[PDB]
Design a protein around this ligand. Structure first.
Ligand SMILES: *[C@@H]1O[C@H](CO)[C@@H](O[C@@H]2O[C@H](CO)[C@@H](O[C@@H]3O[C@H](CO[C@H]4O[C@H](CO)[C@@H](O)[C@H](O)[C@@H]4O)[C@@H](O)[C@H](O[C@H]4O[C@H](CO)[C@@H](O)[C@H](O)[C@@H]4O[C@H]4O[C@H](CO)[C@@H](O)[C@H](O)[C@@H]4O[C@H]4O[C@H](CO)[C@@H](O)[C@H](O)[C@@H]4O)[C@@H]3O)[C@H](O)[C@H]2NC(C)=O)[C@H](O)[C@H]1NC(C)=O
Ligand SMILES: *[C@@H]1O[C@H](CO)[C@@H](O[C@@H]2O[C@H](CO)[C@@H](O[C@@H]3O[C@H](CO[C@H]4O[C@H](CO)[C@@H](O)[C@H](O)[C@@H]4O)[C@@H](O)[C@H](O[C@H]4O[C@H](CO)[C@@H](O)[C@H](O)[C@@H]4O[C@H]4O[C@H](CO)[C@@H](O)[C@H](O)[C@@H]4O)[C@@H]3O)[C@H](O)[C@H]2NC(C)=O)[C@H](O)[C@H]1NC(C)=O
Ligand SMILES: *[C@@H]1O[C@H](CO)[C@@H](O[C@@H]2O[C@H](CO)[C@@H](O[C@@H]3O[C@H](CO[C@H]4O[C@H](CO)[C@@H](O)[C@H](O)[C@@H]4O)[C@@H](O)[C@H](O[C@H]4O[C@H](CO)[C@@H](O)[C@H](O)[C@@H]4O[C@H]4O[C@H](CO)[C@@H](O)[C@H](O)[C@@H]4O)[C@@H]3O)[C@H](O)[C@H]2NC(C)=O)[C@H](O)[C@H]1NC(C)=O
Ligand SMILES: *[C@@H]1O[C@H](CO)[C@@H](O[C@@H]2O[C@H](CO)[C@@H](O[C@@H]3O[C@H](CO[C@H]4O[C@H](CO)[C@@H](O)[C@H](O)[C@@H]4O)[C@@H](O)[C@H](O[C@H]4O[C@H](CO)[C@@H](O)[C@H](O)[C@@H]4O[C@H]4O[C@H](CO)[C@@H](O)[C@H](O)[C@@H]4O)[C@@H]3O)[C@H](O)[C@H]2NC(C)=O)[C@H](O)[C@H]1NC(C)=O
Ligand SMILES: *[C@@H]1O[C@H](CO)[C@@H](O)[C@H](O)[C@H]1NC(C)=O
Ligand SMILES: *[C@@H]1O[C@H](CO)[C@@H](O)[C@H](O)[C@H]1NC(C)=O
Ligand SMILES: *[C@@H]1O[C@H](CO)[C@@H](O)[C@H](O)[C@H]1NC(C)=O
Ligand SMILES: *[C@@H]1O[C@H](CO)[C@@H](O)[C@H](O)[C@H]1NC(C)=O
Ligand SMILES: *[C@@H]1O[C@H](CO)[C@@H](O)[C@H](O)[C@H]1NC(C)=O
Ligand SMILES: *[C@@H]1O[C@H](CO)[C@@H](O)[C@H](O)[C@H]1NC(C)=O
Lengths: 120, 435, 435, 120, 120, 435
């Protein structure tokens, strides 16, 4: 985490670095913890990879979908949002729509890209 | 339009399992099992980042406590049981060369012990400290015999604290507070990220905090609620005070076989004469340091107040005395010689007691027997802080009295972990754009 | 041409490890360790789907059994051993106020017990139930002393059944049979998918099934082979029958220290007078319900048959009596007052016995000692079903007799898990197309 | 599993939902089970993800390869197979060719797409 | 491992076979080992999959990036290197530049493909 | 340009955890827990591949050793303790029918043993072998009673070695050396890859290696340093030698209850007469085989040398005798009848001793008591190799003497695992191209 307090725009050209350490890769006291620590890192990693799989990106870090931005979703200028404020600040307001956005990210893209390219 | 980004610096307060790391013998904290530490644990300063901490709600303390108690019990599990020692004991005083104060402190006591062949007993004797026996109406029994099983610590296991680093699992991180006046709670502008904490030695003590870290500039006063007399005040010094403890008696030990590979280490005869096993605190350094403590306490009470010190009012030895461990030996020192005098506007010596049957972590069941150490014990420690309580009563006028209270080892941890919090990283988020 | 699809609804019979979930004190089933349940465990009905079930080949039963026995032993492991009680006992009868039937049932018995100091014994006494002692030629020994170690259950551990839900790991699912006449085997059109079963209380009993689920409409008769006299017939009621059990004696208990933190809970003196500790079954409800059971049994034997009931013919108390547990106390009730009469075309009271040394799960080794409960015990349960066996002999004409057989706790589980099977999901497959 | 008894054709527009819960994401009784339960879910998940990796799809749910359909593989009309019958029913007949099909899915595509695009 | 001592060129048309068995997919003696054996196989597998994710390939076995070959990196003829010598032999010399190459593989591609296609 | 390839055949020396596999009762090696083996464990020959091996630095040996010792202790954990047998014993000689040599070998000995009711003792007797008792000044104690607890092996657990296969976790592989003259170290052109080793039976012995694999063509001589007298020389035969061992005494056993489900198996009376329990080695085969061993030893010393054999010079029975196990019985045979004569240019019988209290793995603590076997024991084994040491002194001229040294079970493993090494696969690499 080096992007820190830089703005979301600025914070984009460093996603690689943070991504790199997300996975990293008897019994008795400590041995138990080390085992579950390894299991947890794996479970969390995959928990998110499948989501980018479903929100058809896969070749991640940065990707775009076919969902329009809603005006209720903190409709503020791009000149502020993707230039003069940080992720953390953004997450604090946008997170209210997390499930809504995620449902749209999954289905709007899969309903229109899949099926259509199977016909074609 | 809606786009998604992955390696975004977003984190939330979180609770996970942290694990041990060490610098990589066979001590009680088994720090061989911890995996070697990172030779280059470079922190990442987070530029333009604020954060909020609360040392009094920090679950890292609970894990450190849990791990230490569990580990303690694990280490003492595969050891000799002393159940057969719970027999009537015939005791007298050790009077060969009493140096005035050690008058009733050491007892010479015999009993009929189990042997390898369980049809014949042996008559043996050993020495005991006064605090380890109970007179039954000169017949005695071991203290806590009527309450719990007593287990001998394995004689080869060291009790020397080794620094333990706590590390986060991937996907998690530990944030470190760098505000060098942080009072334990609230916002801490200027935070850095680490995967691991610095090493903290699992030093256990009451009243006086030993061998911890120092405050960066000023003596720090920290409490959950400074006006609540039910809460402790932790004081972190910005300078060490030297304390020198000894147990001058030249000891011997006997190995008494009880059964088939089961043997007890008895305190044997003492060579030479007898001593109080006192501790020395540099006189000027100690009280000068208290003057610094007072200057800082005043900030919460008024600059026209009177700060007085007094000793612990009562209770178990762990809360009335300075409990500590040197070399595996357990000391209980009298600190009434330190917590004294009043602030308005050479060497101190503390007599101590030695005790072998110890109920650690203030539990009712499970007692550990500290085997005797033959070499003369000497240890030098850094007093790095205090545990104080504000007294009660009418607390009138401008005069307040503080005492060396204590107990509950979680506070000693808390005094080192206060700069850290655990967060989880959620590397996924969206933002508007036009693409 | 050949194309592949991933999230396809295809599953196969499978066996995996299922885990506990609960609604989230410190009872014998440690259901704190289970993780909280899903507040919204919505099933997915599978439209136009058929499925095949067999309750008599269902491995979910074996896991429930395995988990319960393992868990039982785990919970009783860190407890006081009663080995020192295996000494010659000097017993007489409790005759202060015998209420006719309890004539030889309670014995007043003394012995020389180990004390905290293992060189002196204490003379103590306690009360025992007749079923717990053996006369040795009025000298006695505890029953099962010659067979296994006896361990006292930790006095703080509850034996009240708590519903346990079984849940599948991701990639697996549990299918639920919704055919409300399902006889335990074969096709079950109309099936739903759940990640977790409903909660099943781990209630243990013999002969009469207590506190289970009810049949949806009719009393159900289920068996692996109804014409095989070696198989049990499980009967699931479509209505509860109330059973009220009591142990009226007002008890006291004594705590006898045996050793260093080791203490035994002895049945102490009884306050007031003595009672049989019987159970009440509503008379009309019980026999009316049997009339329903008979109506359904006839479907497999003929509508011109005679159905007769008789009591258990013999064997261990667990198969001759109604074994159950209320509050941690172990009851063995005489059910000959229930299994009677013949079908061609007010309150029942059951005397009971109380026993403290229990060999659970019908194992030879390992005995548990149930500590005494001082408060007067009262419990109300729902009889939800029966375990019946068809008798043998020439089984001629049109007359058949059924008995309250039992044993093998797996059948009690089986009675609740019959609606479920475990399948694995194989989310990958191909089909032809033109692309 | 909501596609249930719907036909394979119908069952296609819901693959997302089933896929979503395939991963989901001490010691003593229960604690042991919970640990292996987590390990197993991960192992099964990956066991299949690598296969879609090899049968060059990755951006899964629905994908096509360069393998022709064999006439021995239940040669029945598409109007029945991908319209009027369920997966379960299909699997019961097509599974006889599982290894054959899988070997072809791996190599026919990798032999012709890889190498050819390395030359190009 | 069947490519064995065949040359790197030859060893290419078999990457599928080796890749297939990289993942494969109580307590007491043996039970402990089996559990950690499963955990380890998973951890190693993912440890590498994320790397191919970052070095934007994903649809792996064979892929190309936008990094030029350095002359210090065993500059020997392709007619030897990718025709007449084995991987093992190659790894023995090229491995000296592992971190250098990897850093370039991650960033040269992500810096130029991402951002550029977000503008576009 | 820079391109990357994944499934590349690149591996490095590595150390990981290997696991058990078996062909899938309840023996001491719990090989039910191992998961069934691969019916078709086809090796992959690596064409044009060289590799380097070192049997004397092979960590597979350390895991096999670690697993066996841990497993041994696990299997013996839930068993009857014999602590109560450490009482004064009253012993005499068994003189009913001594067959000359077995003069002082069997003792008839009585003691006062604990009973189910711990207030009364029983007078019992059993037979002991001379090697299991110590005379205390005809009073005796069990050998090792003064050193360690003695535990009875559970009577139902088999000690018959079952082949164990070691398997690599995915991402790892085991390489097998196919150079059929490999001397244990250095390059081994012609290597194949397997996921699992062949099965190795965990046979334990000293001096003579039993039931192992054979050399492909020649007798092989292997050592870390053949000129270092501190190192052992392992000899692998290219042909088996038959050895037939017996314990002819027809035994009985008594079961003595000690406590509540705790019982000891005592050697009971012997039916018929007494025998030495000797072993037969085919005479010609044995010495012919040594002639082959000599022919090969000469290659390292000179073709004009003298090779002499001598017996073990001294030490514990495990290093002076042929230690082995048949049916759970422990034999210590005298091999001085084998290691004899000199090479310049019918049946052998070995007397043996039987011992029941065994300290396995040459540890100081923990003794196991082998319960008696009643049936007459007969076993036939394949001698497959030798453990030899080169003697010291001036080692002058051209004459050298070898002895049947031994101890340290790791060498027996090493003798089977020498063909294997563990490597890790790193399926990722780059190469130049133009694309
Ligand atoms: C195991 O232990 C459990 C725990 O104790 C047992 O369960 C208990 O069983 C009891 C008996 O069945 C039951 O008691 C009944 O509760 C009913 C519920 O009433 C509730 O509402 C009223 C409203 O004010 C409250 O006051 C009351 O507290 C409750 O909240 C009552 O309605 C029942 O009363 C009837 O029976 C009693 C028996 O003595 C009569 O005295 C009473 O008058 C009622 O009977 C009249 O009505 C019936 C209706 O058909 C007539 O048939 C009958 O002849 C009576 O009617 C005549 O008399 C009245 C009055 O003179 C007159 O007006 C009318 O015109 C007629 O002349 C009764 O109180 C407990 O609640 C129940 N406990 C629990 C927790 O469930 C269980 O059974 C035990 N099991 C076994 C095997 O023993
Ligand atoms: C606050 O922080 C300070 C500073 O770190 C810390 O002080 C240190 O405490 C430890 C533990 O008491 C001290 O360690 C002991 O030191 C003695 C003295 O040895 C000196 O001379 C040797 C000569 O080579 C030097 O190497 C050494 O550095 C010293 O100069 C040692 O003798 C002790 O070792 C024995 O006891 C150990 C206990 O487990 C054994 O493990 C070890 O093998 C040794 O035992 C053997 O000898 C015994 C002699 O009688 C014998 O009885 C045993 O059976 C066995 O044979 C040990 O090293 C350390 O020196 C202190 N540091 C300083 C600078 O003095 C404070 O304790 C800490 N405060 C708190 C409260 O934690
Ligand atoms: C079929 O299903 C039924 C219905 O669920 C089930 O019946 C229930 O059985 C349980 C277990 O026997 C009963 O629980 C006990 O109830 C008594 C009665 O308390 C009443 O009054 C209090 C007042 O506040 C109410 O809260 C309560 O709801 C009742 O109205 C309780 O006293 C029991 O608690 C004591 O024993 C527990 C045993 O582990 C302790 O954990 C607990 O802390 C209490 O112990 C303390 O008090 C004791 C008094 O002597 C003392 O000895 C102890 O040392 C300690 O101090 C307990 O709650 C429950 O009430 C029954 N339900 C109903 C409706 O009656 C059947 O058992 C079930 N059948 C089968 C076969 O499983
Ligand atoms: C090198 O490799 C060789 C060859 O594999 C190996 O030899 C084998 O050693 C084992 C172990 O000593 C031998 O196994 C025993 O054989 C006897 C003889 O039984 C014969 O007759 C039966 C009749 O049906 C045949 O089936 C059988 O194959 C033989 O022909 C058996 O009686 C033994 O079984 C008893 O002891 C077991 C010990 O755990 C019990 O588990 C088992 O249940 C049996 O016990 C029961 O009977 C006992 C009789 O007194 C009684 O006391 C018990 O309480 C219980 O009731 C066992 O099978 C095997 O036969 C040998 N193989 C050959 C070809 O002879 C070498 O040992 C090996 N060398 C080394 C050093 O490892
Ligand atoms: C962007 O800034 C302009 C400046 O006047 C303002 O009118 C407009 O509404 C802003 N857009 C949003 C979404 O805030
Ligand atoms: C040992 O037992 C004897 C028995 O009479 C007793 O007199 C003696 O005092 C006991 N010894 C001790 C030290 O308790
Ligand atoms: C206790 O021991 C004495 C020893 O003589 C015996 O007389 C007495 O009966 C014993 N008491 C009991 C209750 O067994
Ligand atoms: C499809 O249906 C037509 C209808 O006549 C039939 O002739 C044809 O063979 C069918 N194709 C297959 C593959 O069954
Ligand atoms: C390739 O071979 C030619 C042959 O003369 C040589 O000149 C050239 O330098 C070689 N290239 C490399 C990179 O070795
Ligand atoms: C048993 O104890 C009695 C007590 O006097 C003793 O005489 C006898 O010899 C003991 N028996 C044995 C076999 O040790």
């Amino acid at each position: 985490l080096g992007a820190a307090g830089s703005t979301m725009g600025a914070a984009s050209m460093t996603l690689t670095v943070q991504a790199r350490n997300l996975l990293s890769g008897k019994l008795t006291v400590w041995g138990i913890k080390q085992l579950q620590a390894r299991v947890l890192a794996v479970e969390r990693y995959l928990r998110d990879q499948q989501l980018l799989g479903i929100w058809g990106c896969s070749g991640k870090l940065i990707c775009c979908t076919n969902v329009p931005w809603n005006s209720s979703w903190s409709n503020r200028n791009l000149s502020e949002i993707w230039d003069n404020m940080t992720w953390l600040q953004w997450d604090k307001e946008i997170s209210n729509y997390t499930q809504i956005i995620y449902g749209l990210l999954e289905e709007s893209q899969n309903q229109q890209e899949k099926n259509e390219q199977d016909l074609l | 339009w809606v786009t998604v980004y992955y390696g975004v610096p977003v984190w939330k307060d979180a609770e996970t399992t942290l694990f041990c790391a060490s610098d990589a013998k066979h001590n009680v904290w088994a720090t061989h099992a911890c995996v070697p530490t990172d030779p280059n644990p470079q922190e990442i300063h987070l530029e333009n980042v604020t954060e909020e901490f609360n040392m009094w709600k920090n679950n890292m303390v609970e894990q450190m406590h849990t791990d230490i108690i569990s580990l303690w019990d694990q280490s003492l599990k595969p050891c000799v049981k002393l159940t057969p020692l719970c027999v009537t004991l015939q005791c007298t005083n050790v009077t060969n060369n009493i140096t005035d104060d050690m008058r009733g402190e050491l007892k010479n006591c015999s009993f009929n012990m189990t042997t390898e062949l369980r049809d014949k007993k042996q008559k043996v004797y050993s020495l005991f400290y006064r605090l380890d026996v109970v007179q039954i109406n000169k017949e005695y029994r071991l203290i806590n015999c009527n309450t719990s099983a007593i287990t001998q610590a394995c004689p080869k296991v060291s009790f020397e604290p080794i620094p333990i680093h706590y590390c986060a699992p991937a996907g998690f991180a530990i944030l470190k507070c760098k505000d060098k006046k942080f009072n334990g709670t609230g916002p801490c502008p200027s935070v850095s990220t680490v995967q691991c904490t610095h090493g903290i030695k699992p030093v256990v003590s009451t009243q006086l905090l030993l061998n911890g870290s120092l405050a960066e500039e000023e003596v720090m006063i920290r409490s959950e609620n400074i006006t609540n007399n039910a809460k402790n005040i932790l004081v972190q010094f910005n300078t060490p005070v030297q304390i020198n403890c000894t147990r001058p008696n030249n000891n011997t030990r006997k190995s008494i076989r009880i059964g088939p590979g089961q043997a007890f280490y008895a305190t044997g005869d003492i060579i030479g004469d007898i001593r109080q096993a006192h501790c020395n605190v540099s006189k000027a350094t100690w009280n000068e340091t208290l003057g610094k403590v007072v200057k800082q306490l005043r900030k919460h009470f008024g600059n026209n107040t009177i700060i007085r010190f007094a000793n612990s009012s009562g209770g178990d030895l762990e809360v009335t005395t300075h409990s500590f461990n040197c070399g595996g030996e357990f000391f209980y020192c009298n600190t009434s010689g330190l917590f004294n005098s009043t602030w308005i506007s050479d060497s101190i010596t503390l007599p101590c007691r030695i005790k072998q049957i110890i109920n650690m972590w203030q539990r009712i069941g499970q007692a550990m027997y500290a085997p005797p150490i033959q070499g003369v014990i000497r240890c030098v420690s850094n007093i790095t802080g205090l545990i104080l309580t504000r007294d009660g009563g009418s607390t009138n006028s401008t005069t307040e009295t503080f005492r060396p209270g204590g107990g509950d080892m979680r506070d000693n941890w808390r005094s080192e972990l206060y700069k850290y919090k655990v967060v989880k990283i959620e590397p996924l988020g969206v933002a508007p754009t036009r693409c």
